[PDB]
Design a protein around this ligand. Structure first.
Ligand code: NA
Ligand code: NA
Ligand code: NA
Ligand code: NA
Lengths: 489, 487, 491, 491
């Protein structure tokens, strides 16, 4: 796949930040590098945000929230800006998908069809909410008029990760912008290009200066400055369960609202009456989609004993057949992990699996000459206390376990600190709904897997998070409820 | 003294766990006082870490299986409504308990606290059958719906200023969602909650649905917040403890809803009805002896009327009749504890020494009891301690201003934003100001109003989330999105 | 073995039965009375004061006045809720009295009136008492120059007419939702069954309802019903009854541009696909039609059976039909009572004849039962086609029609070809086929692997000619509200 | 000073104007035509194809077909949303063309058609496009044994009829909400003004609306309008127009138990209390009636003034009436156009004569204006009383009645003493009295210190004989919906 003229032009220069409407370098001129994970080459050199640039972005956001066009503008006008942004993202679909395949590592075609169209659709959907963020009129007594106002919190601080970079930026900004908030967003050090290219689309659509501010860099500096900034009203984060604790601890000094989307160890359960063909594909896609770098991956495939052998065999074959290559290569089905660090983490989870007694039915090592690749892996002969079955691996690594009863599979699926999503496969109308009701997960797919949509909320139970993104529900994280009483005698 | 409260005070006060009245496993007890007399009112079983582990087991169990978990929403509603009736039937008993244990006048405990508690459980009983999720039209290939499921076991800690009512703010919404509870009342006021336990058993709550565990903050309180099986935590009290509660909740990605301190403004604009505004400004701070998170402790008054309102507030400050809550003539009681009286008396000294002048009060009252005279500070600056910090006593600070843009900025220049009041006869100016103030609830030409139906909570460091109204149900809910492939 | 008359019902039945206007128990201004019967024995059960137009007029005046001013206009939402809740406690307390009056006046079995009817009505009032404090409007963010908000105001005086089949629960369907909004009421029960309601009047009084909030005016359709439909001062109207009278109401209401809510009949289909848990569907098919002697608007009067199962289902429906114990609602052994009236008995017997004349075979039942009383035998019709009078028209008796089908697309099309569409039942164990079929059926309520379920929190009503609007749930409240949009210039 | 005709509107008028059925532009099957005029000049503006009853069957078949299968039935909600949004972009692209048609065909000033009408129609479609993805039903927790959910199903083929006063925006009020639900439409524009909507039809083709989702049928009320109202296959009817035709529609709709929506006339009151900002209120009172030449259902045709200010506002309204610049809508100087037709001019001139016959005084206007065209002078009536025809009936021209009043309780009695209740205006600087008076007024929209504000997000509709239901806001969606309650037994 050849590089688009516009990405070629964008990559031929240092990548600048976006603060108060202008593209800029860091105040002290620091820069960092982002890699193409298929080759290990440098892809771009990016301006690095420091504590001081984060202060400059927060000021810009604060000033755009209080005075200015963003603050005076009608709800209909604001909706139009957000919808114009989506048209532009759609105009630039090929450019964004190329950037995403190159910087993050996923196959071009799926970044075009899944990521880019999902981010488009999410802004279209949230553009419609600006005019519909309603409060209440509460009849209490004829002596008062009681109403509530859902006022945007103000300046929000957002940090997203590297696995679905552009789409993850829309999960945080669609809802936030629709309430009328102002943003200071930090992309992952591994994948800042998509959003920095998107920056020019926020300007072209007509976003007023400072409404949106993009700051690439590192957690120890740019991330920390976001979470600790005194003039940031609310914070939102997606990433590892470990950092969400830190962010929630640091947010306690200001009593700041928090939204957290974290890891999982989600189950995909195949009961006796499942349509096995559809469920084997679901289990396989469930873990292998996006190389398993998906918090909601169906990393624990539970299979009723009657079908266990059949699905272990089918999933091994599928695993051995996946096609590894660079994301810009047209016949690639799975790319590599995003970084040397990640490859080393997941490979180590594999060793850990091995030496704790489990077996490698497929994969279980690196792949190819260069790049951060890992062969799709299938672990068999597994136990519930094993590290590979309790902990999020973040790679194309599945663990398959047999069970004998429905009561049993429900108890084992729930026996986790995580609770993000789950899958249940059965043709029965009663057991599909019964099983989904008892599972302690934020999303449940009956006879399918890995589905998201701007309109249906997403988030975890337990240590998989606090709050929800997508749908009407995400609006509430960016709002502050005011209850007005008007005495009328 | 009512016979049922006499019988209740005649024995050590037991905790309520898994449907039963029990003593602490380790046998410890603590004393609760009567703040008018300084005497011990009762000895109470003291909950240790291991009593909290027993309450949580009982809670966990009642939620996972059994009647509470199997009950229709109409059946749950009936139980909650029946509790409301029982609290109403025992209104005089609970009112006396509140007055004796907290300190507040009997009649206000009866007319406000008990009726508000009853109203709250009737309101929330009404929501059990009405907590709906959505059906989302997305695609003909799927059926998309959300369930609003209860979180599970909740940990609740409440303060001493409005002991019974706050047990309802917390429990009514949680119980309506089908949650199970572990609640610790304040050590200064454990009595009314523990007497109300009787009424949960008599209404028919199955065992373990509710568990009352009194004790101290660094033992029972920390046991709740650090407990591995508590699914969600809610707290009302100081902003300094709230930080601790959120820090510790972080270890387990536990949801938190917090109601905390304030330093709310009560603004008298030039076109206000001055007679109504003076009374509102005075009730605003002096209600419940200023032991109220939402108290209007900063009275801003347009320069044109500053001196008029100071005279009136001084007059009214000295007219307040101080005495024990159990005496009929009493308008204001004492402060809850010795520690509190020292605290507010020490805030008064800090104000004199910073250069403010005490136009009324500013010292203790009477021979015994933790009483402080209603106090009015003048010649104050925004810079002073007495004007930034929550005093939590019957102390008001009166501040002249010259313009509407100035007052808005000075009101908002705070770390707090729980509540605010604005007094103005003008339609436009009333809503413009209301919109502009960074505060959870704004009252236009009124002050201190609460209702089960209207959300309450703070912006900034006054809190996270809201209690009361429909809004409160969300804190006790875990949202599940279900996708059913029908293609 | 007769169920013994309750002392308070004998006291009640001993006097002439009065109307309830402006808080007082009154006779008709003209002094006219009519008779109500016991459809099991045909005796006169009670003498009831009969409302004329003049009486309806005084009901409206009392209603108007309780709405515009006084305690009910001034009460807080909590106070109103408490009233509604107290009313439900009192209905629960008089449960036996009320269930006997239902058994006695309507004819249905006492135990089912107790367990179902009465407790549904208690529970419907408790549900709605809970809405009172929660009927919320919107705050709409349009622009920084205005404060935009809505008010969901009560319409005012509401004219309500209910039928005879579920007398007390049908009273609660109408009044719970309307009273919750803060509306005022003029209610008319069916000439066949006025007693459940006029007894319940004691309890509205004992609960502390202010005068004129609630007004019960029994009588006949051509006088009292029409006076309500036509009153210049009635703000909104709600009706349940024949699809023929629904039209008259909706036609008259045109003159005053009055909002109308209608609940009317059906020919609801009960579909048993191949993958049904058959034992269950057979019990649902039988109860779907036989419950309440088929005097149910949502009766699954058309039982569609996939061909594999048709013979099995017919055999079972026949045997069950023939085993039903017919008797008086007040006898303990009774499983099914009589039809409400002589007129109704003549209507269904006649529909049965039309059935035989058109070619269908009567597999069970098909005639009157017992020596006296308005009884009809549970009836099963086979050898039926979609064009027959009996499969198209509502019979309103314990009469079922059983039809084989050979594919799902076929049964959906045949189920849907009706001017009715009140309810539907589908029996299948498949997760996809269940919801697919439920989505394709044109009905207001679809039950999947069940039938005849109602609950206060779940809307009910028809598509096509089975009605307009919905009752129960949050949805019912909108019928009694007038949305007001207020704009406040804030410069 | 003439506004130059846009070349695309010149091309469009150069030809016979076709109707729009099943995505194609067609003539009437019978070949009939009628003429629409320019009310400023009285010449024929265009010849338009006249839809007969046969043409309404064709429109309905195509709508029916587009609702049951094909892309419109298959489409995801994000896809339907995207069609509605693309439409809004195209209307905005053609803003000048559409505003000129409005000005030429209806009579109103170009600049106001542009700024108000066109911009509001674009914004209404944008708002409703946002609703397609967010139209949700409920999941109701009743018991562990069932899963209870509801679906908001589109009703199906909807018949729509709109008037001539705000032609395009009224087309969007009706279609935005109906399309958002997933309905299929058959829409009759008024005989006096079909141009706007038949031109916009080009933009529905170009946005990619599937064949038959939208069908535009122009003609006369007694042929095409009647054919829509009486068509057996239309599932729902919506109408904006005269109180009299609203009665006819409801009466006819009874026959099929078809839901109705009615946006009818008014006689709205505009109240200036003793404490109003008199500057702003005089302008409000004036704009309140004269906007769109008084051809507005919600016009403040009754301006009530506290006695203290009566003379000051009479004097100001008279000075402002005598100053309105009457002229063609396509001339730049123009502040007020002509009435829409000969017939409408006679009707308002007649009401003015009825006013003088009953004893009222003309303080300004009261007669025709200019050489040709259908103009009437802005008119101000005084010395008027409540029982007069002019203060009671909707005139529908630039004719106001000013009434003094002495107390607040008094003016609320007199404003509410009307069969109308569409809107109302209240001017007072006091926070308390502002809401108190808004609370007590029986009108669907109350503007506190403003008048004539409509937004896509705020509901609009009348109380009493001013209508049934609401349009705009979330509330309009329910008129195009059918509620289905699904119960899934889960043991
Ligand atoms: Na990279
Ligand atoms: Na105490
Ligand atoms: Na009878
Ligand atoms: Na014309």
């Amino acid at each position: 796949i050849e590089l688009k003229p516009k990405v070629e032009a964008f990559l031929n220069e240092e990548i600048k930040m976006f603060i108060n409407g202008e593209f800029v370098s860091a105040i002290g001129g620091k820069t960092f590098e982002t890699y193409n994970p298929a080759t290990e080459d440098v892809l771009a050199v990016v301006c690095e945000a420091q504590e001081e640039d984060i202060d400059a972005a927060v000021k810009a956001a604060r000033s755009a929230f209080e005075s200015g066009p963003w603050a005076e503008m009608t709800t209909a006008e604001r909706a139009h800006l957000i919808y114009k942004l989506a048209d532009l993202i759609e105009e630039h679909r090929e450019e964004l998908a190329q950037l995403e395949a190159l910087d993050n590592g996923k196959p071009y075609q799926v970044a075009l069809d899944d990521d880019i169209s999902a981010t488009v659709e999410n802004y279209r959907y949230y553009a419609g909410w600006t005019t519909k963020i309603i409060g209440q009129t509460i009849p209490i007594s004829k002596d008062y008029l009681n109403y509530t106002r859902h006022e945007p919190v103000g300046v929000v601080g957002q940090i997203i990760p590297w696995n679905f970079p552009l789409v993850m930026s829309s999960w945080k900004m669609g809802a936030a912008l629709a309430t009328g908030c102002t943003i200071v967003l930090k992309p992952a050090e591994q994948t800042p290009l998509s959003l920095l290219y998107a920056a020019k689309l926020f300007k072209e659509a007509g976003f007023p200066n400072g409404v949106v501010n993009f700051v690439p860099g590192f957690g120890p500096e740019a991330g920390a400055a976001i979470v600790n900034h005194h003039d940031i009203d609310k914070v939102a984060f997606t990433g590892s369960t470990v950092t969400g604790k830190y962010i929630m601890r640091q947010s306690a000094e200001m009593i700041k609202h928090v939204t957290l989307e974290l890891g999982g160890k989600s189950p995909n359960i195949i009961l006796e009456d499942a349509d096995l063909e559809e469920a084997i594909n679901g289990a396989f896609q469930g873990i292998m989609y996006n190389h398993g770098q998906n918090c909601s991956a169906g990393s624990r495939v539970f299979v009723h004993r009657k079908h266990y052998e059949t699905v272990v065999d089918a999933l091994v074959k599928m695993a051995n057949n996946v096609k590894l290559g660079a994301g810009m290569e047209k016949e690639t089905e799975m790319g590599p992990l995003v970084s040397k660090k990640q490859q080393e983490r997941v490979l180590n989870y594999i060793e850990q699996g091995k030496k704790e007694g489990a077996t490698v039915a497929a994969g279980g090592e690196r792949a190819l000459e260069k790049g951060y690749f890992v062969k799709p892996t299938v672990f068999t002969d597994v136990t519930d206390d094993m590290t590979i079955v309790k902990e999020e691996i973040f790679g194309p690594v599945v663990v398959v376990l047999p069970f004998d009863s429905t009561e049993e599979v429900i108890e084992r699926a729930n026996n986790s600190s995580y609770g993000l999503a789950a899958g249940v496969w059965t043709q029965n109308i009663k057991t599909g709904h019964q099983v989904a009701n008892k599972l302690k997960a934020g999303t449940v797919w009956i006879n399918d897997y890995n589905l998201e949509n701007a309109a249906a909320p997403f988030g975890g139970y337990k240590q998989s998070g606090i709050g929800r993104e997508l749908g009407s529900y995400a609006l509430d994280n960016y709002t502050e409820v005011k209850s007005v009483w008007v005495n009328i005698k």
